[PDB]
Design a protein around this nucleic acid. Structure first.
Length: 181
RNA sequence: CUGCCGUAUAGGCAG
């Protein structure tokens, strides 16, 4: 399994939820800049039982990809509000799990607008057809339109072996799993 | 939130 290195970043007091969002956004910028699909995240102090991500962000990658990511100054500026481990090989063996963005059909009105574009119906028709998530999340800003949105994250069932797939520019699964420990 | 894929009131996705 090739994404066998990691770095833990822990939040330092100041508020925690807001700080994690800034950190996660900075990571996104860095991933977009690098353009790859082989850097993953997990939240090892997760409390799914309270929809809390916890205060530890773990970054997962090959040795070379982690080194390249960390070489960029994407953290300087936040550095004083973070505490760092050392980039390291993961323990082994460990289970693996998938850390995924989850989306839902949470707004029927938006569905109706699309359905109207796709079937030339009217709102009353659409409203008849399409009548009126409990996960941790980060709140991000849509850099193109300045709209804030919640990105909900699921840590899936543990399993014994890994996967071949990659990751998005938020570090979330596009098929890939990360070691869980 | 806004949009994309899909006949979908199927299942996904983008920022």
């Amino acid at each position: 399994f090739t994404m066998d290195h990691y770095l833990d970043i822990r939040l330092r007091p100041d508020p925690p939820a807001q700080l994690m969002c800034v950190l996660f956004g900075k990571l996104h910028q860095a991933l977009v800049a690098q353009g790859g699909d082989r850097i993953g995240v997990s939240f090892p102090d997760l409390d799914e039982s309270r929809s809390r991500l916890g205060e530890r962000l773990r970054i997962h990658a090959s040795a070379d990809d982690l080194r390249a990511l960390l070489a960029r100054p994407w953290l300087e500026g936040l550095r004083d509000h973070l505490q760092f481990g050392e980039p390291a090989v993961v323990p082994h063996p460990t289970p693996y799990r998938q850390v995924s963005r989850v989306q839902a059909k949470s707004n029927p009105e938006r569905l109706r607008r699309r359905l109207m574009r796709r079937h030339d119906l009217s709102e009353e028709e659409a409203r008849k057809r399409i009548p009126d998530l409990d996960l941790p999340f980060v709140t991000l800003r849509s850099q193109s339109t300045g709209q804030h949105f919640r990105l909900f994250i699921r840590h899936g069932p543990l399993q014994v072996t890994a996967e071949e797939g990659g990751f998005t520019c938020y570090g979330l699964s596009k098929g890939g799993f990360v070691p869980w420990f």
